[PDB]
Copies of this chain bind each other. A is one copy, B any other.
Amino acid sequence: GEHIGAMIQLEENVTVPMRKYMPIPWSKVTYNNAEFWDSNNPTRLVVPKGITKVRVAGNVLWDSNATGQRMLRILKNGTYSIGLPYTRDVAISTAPQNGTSGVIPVKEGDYFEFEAFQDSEGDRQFRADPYTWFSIEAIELETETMEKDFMLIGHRGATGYTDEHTIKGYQMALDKGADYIELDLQLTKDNKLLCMHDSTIDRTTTGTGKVGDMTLSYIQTNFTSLNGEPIPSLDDVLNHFGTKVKYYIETKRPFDANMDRELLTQLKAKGLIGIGSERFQVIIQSFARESLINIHNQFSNIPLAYLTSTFSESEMDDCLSYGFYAIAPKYTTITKELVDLAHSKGLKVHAWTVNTKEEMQSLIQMGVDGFFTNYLDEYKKI
């Protein structure tokens, strides 16, 4: 490919008053691929639209003075940010300072400023020298994410029209127009995962007892759903659908690291997550914030949704702090004011358990970004 980035340097020495922080007004450009700098805003390196992650670095050269300290610092949007360099050291002769940042995320409109500080008697000269430069590099570029402005979820297999949590039900939901299928998983006596909602299988299947009481093979062989359909495991569903379908997955409210570890291993084995996966092909939700944090610490690219029944500004702020992709409040608690507030904060709002066309239309008017509907065709009836 071709390098994307820019580098700027001074043409005349800048004077730094003693013990005062000062962004450097860079004057000329060594090179600039596309609009990384603006003449009317010399102190700022601006990130253009088509960039997601950048690397920033610079170097400094002062006039000969062996007193006080010198500082090299880079600020994002005029304030501190993660992954930026910072250096202080004793000054001898010109006391050059060099620093480089790690790969950090950014968005259109973000800017970086080179900040300098000195503690020597009198003013100091920020020399315009080949060893005095400010550079920014683009590491990641925007690309199609498979995301949709509105997402329709086949709530628990679209059981409103057929049996719940079965391959036939998932296929019917996809045919009816489901954007995402919802999967509920529990561990059997073995480490394998079984697709069911209730902890006890008696409600949904001819069998009885907890899912963890017996092995996966016995449960899948000796028992079947009330409609006689097979009880598919996670591996079976993944093999049947593969990458053709986007999956919505819920974890246990009672947090357990083994469940998340097994789910992540199974998902990575099929390539649905990780280096070779698509960002939005899989979405994970959970009432347990700890499970979401654990998943994020391992796979940060996986979008996460937080399930709650107390939609409020506190919950939205908490979700924004941890970087969750969306918040899933109960539909009864949603109002246009809260939806607008969430959109301002950058969070997506999904209403779950929507089963009436009038309520669906009201939520659409409220601007809700997605629904978990047991009945799917009502969306077409709007």
Contacts and interface: CB of A to CB of B under 8 A. Distances in A.
A98 B100 CA distance: 8
A214 interface: no
A32 B93 contact: no
Interface in A1-52: 2-7, 9, 28-35, 37, 39, 48, 50, 52
Contact of A130 (B37, B81, B92, B300): B81
Interface string A39-83: 100000000101011000111010000000100000000001111
Given A96-B87, A297-B32, A82 B2 contact: no
Contact of A90 (B34, B89, B103): B89
A319 to B, nearest CB: 16
Contact of A135 (B35, B97, B102, B268): B102
B86 A61 contact: yes
A125 B113 CA distance: 28
A84 B57 CA distance: 11
Contacts of A52: 3
B102 A137 contact: yes
Nearest to A264: B35
A298 interface: yes
The 7 tightest CB contacts between A and B, nearest first, are A102-B135, A86-B96, A86-B131, A3-B140, A34-B274, A90-B90, A82-B130
Contacts of A58: 102
